[PDB]
């Protein structure tokens, strides 16, 4: 996260750090708890991931230094990538991780609400991006989970900022015209969480952008409201 500040423990209890153990263990992507055996994240995270056996989901983490060999984690039973997904820049950048065991909810880890189909018309003004990503273009994964408040941008305004790309209505953009605050490398897959009527909703999934926090280059996110039926299809299967 560029231009953000340290989060407080328990501030974003749906936020997870997804690690890969191949070739060595490291943070791969962010993700969000949406159900007691489900993590919602970005499909591009899994480029070259041949098996869910190499994945570890850590919940209730503030600092990456909390993670050692003896730290508990959730194994991944299945990686479900949207079948229209080709690449982040073309959309459908959404995946579900079905966990091997159930997440016990509490003050350190709990799910975030998905948006309501009725709330596709609501105007969110309190949106935050979180993650352990870089704080500048050439950096390293941060120890402490960072946060930044960023305004949503209309699809029309985002399209002007991305000449040569097709910004679809299944994408949502966020950023300041002057730049300065944005997601950066290692934040992908994490949430764009918006507070409306005292409830937090998972509005976006960090997906792609041209650089980090540049002027007139907002971050592009998967527009979660457009995938609520896809999520329910995958999570509520008979």
């Amino acid at each position: 996260i560029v231009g953000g500040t340290a989060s407080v423990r328990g501030e974003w209890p749906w936020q997870v750090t997804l690690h890969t153990t191949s070739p060595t263990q490291r943070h791969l992507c962010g993700g969000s708890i949406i159900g007691n055996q489900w993590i919602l994240t970005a499909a591009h995270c899994f480029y070259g991931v041949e098996s869910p056996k190499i994945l570890r989901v850590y919940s209730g983490i503030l600092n990456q230094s909390e993670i050692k060999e003896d730290t508990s984690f959730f194994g991944v039973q299945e990686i479900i990538i949207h079948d229209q997904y080709k690449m982040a820049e073309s959309g459908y950048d959404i995946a579900l991780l079905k966990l091997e065991t159930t997440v016990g909810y509490g003050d350190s880890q709990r799910p975030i609400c998905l948006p309501s189909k009725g709330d596709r018309n609501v105007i969110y003004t309190d949106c935050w991006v979180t993650g352990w990503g870089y704080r500048k273009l050439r950096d390293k994964i941060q120890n402490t989970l960072q946060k930044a408040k960023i305004p949503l941008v209309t699809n029309e305004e985002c399209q002007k900022r991305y000449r040569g790309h097709k910004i679809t209505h299944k994408m949502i953009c966020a950023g300041y015209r002057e730049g300065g605050k944005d997601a950066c490398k290692g934040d992908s897959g994490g949430p764009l969480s918006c507070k409306h009527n005292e409830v937090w909703h998972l509005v976006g999934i960090t997906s792609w952008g041209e650089g980090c926090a540049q002027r007139e280059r907002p971050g592009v996110y998967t527009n979660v409201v457009e995938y609520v039926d896809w999520i329910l299809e995958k999570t509520q299967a008979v």
Binding site: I34, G35, N36, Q37, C113, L114, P115, S116, Q236
Partner: peptide, 7 residues
């Protein structure tokens, strides 16, 4: 949450 995820 209005949108319910089955346990």
């Amino acid at each position: 949450c209005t949108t319910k995820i089955k346990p």
